[PDB]
From TrEMBL, chain B:
Residues 3-63 form the HTH tetR-type domain. This is EilR repressor. Keywords: DNA-binding. It comes from the Bacteria. The keyword DNA-binding applies. Gene3D superfamilies: Tetracycline Repressor, domain 2. InterPro entries: Homeodomain-like_sf, HTH-type_TetR-like_transc_reg, HTH_TetR, Tet_transcr_reg_TetR-rel_C_sf. PROSITE patterns: HTH_TETR_2. GO terms for molecular function: DNA-binding transcription factor activity; transcription cis-regulatory region binding. Residues 26-45 bind DNA.
């Protein structure tokens, strides 16, 4: 192996330890084991364990953003929803790590810089679908796509913050009703 | 006497909580604030957690009363004042409220207290909607409960983006995005 394909065989191993056990299990030794490489060789790439868990967390999200890009001929409403509040069981670890990363960003500026970058990735993706739907002629925009993109994200994050507490009146079904509701007020007035 | 001093202790915990936060709510700094011995704190409080959790609820409870307007202002200005008021004097309440949901992942009592404040916050938003719906100023296309949660989620949400230092989400923009969802939720 030359130099850079190594970096990937390492990075991808970390991306599963994140999905499997979360940040608290993304120790240099766990990535070294999952990859089948010497533990000392891991320090050779992505110094500062903090980096191989923030730099890895991004790749997990980027993978999440791509595992949701679905049939383009589907209604721009169907696309936007799945890109904001998908209920696929396969994404539970992706969300779990995202929820997890949001807290750690308090006591880990390294994460914070990364969590900030995903919010921009999550935002730049919604803006695309908002603009695209607007250009196609299905979305009616009463405000800039950017403003709409931030407000919907805030709805998801905000509701997730309540859904995790255990509110019965805010569960899967209700988390969907609210979201689909707001989409109508923002794009189908 | 019996409770007249229990309140001073609570008033001493509610005070340092806004000044120092949960990290600085030690028994030695709380007993100093009330001006009493430290031992008398455990006498009135079994666990140190029951003091941290209850005091936090008591801070927010009065916080919501402080920001209660005259009831004659427009129901929109009232609902707004209880959602996203941009006031410097709230920062200590907010900072404590942000910390409250963070520690909730590891402190079951702070989790219990935070869950209760969100319901109080929600119960108070329902009130303004129903009163503004009765006065005929609001137009409801959904129950006050659902609208309230969506409005609260919008605040908690942008707030999670605001603190990160996003330039396009500033003090002014936060106000704008909040005024917008009110317009759509209640004025169609
Ligand atoms: C495909 N895609 C782009 C997605 C997919 C899912 C989400 C989030 C989510 C969706 C539905 C949920 N339920 C039905 C229970 C719970 C959480 C979510 C993720 C992170 C988050 N935070 C970090 C606070 C809050 C919510 C976001 C983007
Ligand atoms: C009077 N009243 C009932 C209030 C008053 C203020 C708030 C919150 C708030 C308002 C405006 C902000 N800016 C203009 C920057 C930032 C935060 C707030 C508080 C806690 C919170 N979380 C715990 C997530 C999120 C937002 C909520 C209720």
């Amino acid at each position: 192996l030359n130099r850079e394909e190594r970096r990937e065989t390492i990075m991808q191993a970390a991306m599963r330890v994140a999905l499997d056990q979360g940040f608290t299990g993304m120790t240099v030794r766990n990535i070294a084991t999952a990859a089948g490489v010497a533990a000392g060789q891991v320090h050779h790439h992505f110094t500062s364990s903090g980096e191989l868990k923030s730099q890895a967390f991004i790749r997990v999200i980027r993978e999440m953003m791509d595992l949701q890009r679905l049939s383009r001929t589907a209604g721009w409403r169907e696309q936007l929803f799945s890109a904001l509040g998908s209920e696929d069981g396969r994404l539970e670890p992706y969300i779990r790590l995202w929820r997890q990363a949001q807290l750690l960003a308090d006591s880990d500026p390294e994460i914070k810089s990364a969590y900030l970058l995903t919010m921009n990735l999550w935002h730049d993706e919604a803006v695309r679908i908002i603009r695209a739907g607007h250009a196609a002629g299905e979305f009616t925009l009463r405000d800039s796509a950017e403003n709409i993109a931030w407000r919907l994200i805030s709805l998801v994050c905000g509701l997730d913050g309540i859904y995790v507490l255990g509110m019965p009146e805010v569960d899967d079904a209700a988390f969907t009703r609210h979201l689909q509701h707001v989409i109508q007020l923002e794009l189908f007035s």
